[PDB]
Design a protein that fits this description.
Radius of gyration of chain A: 22 Å
Chain A: T-complex protein 1 subunit eta
Largest sheet of chain B: none
Organism of A: Saccharomyces cerevisiae
Shape of chain B: elongated
Number of helices of chain B: 3
Number of helices of chain A: 1
Distance between the termini of chain B: 24 Å
Keywords: TRiC/CCT, actin, phosducin-like protein, chaperone
Structural class of chain B: mainly alpha
Oligomer: part of a larger assembly
Entry title: yeast TRiC-plp2-actin complex at S4 closed TRiC state
Strand content of chain B: under 5%
Structural class of chain A: mainly alpha
Number of strands of chain A: 0
PDB class: chaperone
Distance between the termini of chain A: 66 Å
Largest interface: A-B, 3 and 3 residues
Radius of gyration of chain B: 19 Å
Chain lengths: ~50, ~60
């Protein structure tokens, strides 16, 4: 009423990441599999550094 | 060290694992040290007059 715009009230702050859907927990698993790939060939005596 | 690395490049092309390459130089390095320790002669039996000359042999080599 005090303004012609009447902005819609967002729940969270601007810039907050996305939310529920399909692939949220899968991204966390793929993030762990990504870090797990770096430590993968370092296993055993015949590994690498 | 570059000579060991340059010769290791050809062996990586053949598909040898690097640990077998590294273990080979470790056994070869100790074997070469064990041979060179036997063949070299001792100079402590000589007197001080000749021991000074051995320093002159190495002094002219380093300068």
């Amino acid at each position: 009423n005090f303004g012609s715009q009447t902005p819609t009230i967002v729940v969270l702050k601007e810039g907050t990441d996305a939310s529920q859907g399909k692939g949220q927990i899968i991204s966390n698993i793929n993030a762990c599999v990504a870090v797990q790939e770096a430590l993968k060939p370092t296993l055993g005596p015949l590994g690498s550094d | 060290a570059s000579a060991l690395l340059d010769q290791a490049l050809e062996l990586i092309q053949k598909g040898i694992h690097p640990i077998k390459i590294a273990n080979g130089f470790d056994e070869a390095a100790k074997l070469a040290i064990s041979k060179l320790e036997e063949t070299c002669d001792d100079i402590s039996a000589s007197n001080d007059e000749l021991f000074r000359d051995f320093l002159l042999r190495a002094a002219k080599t380093s300068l």
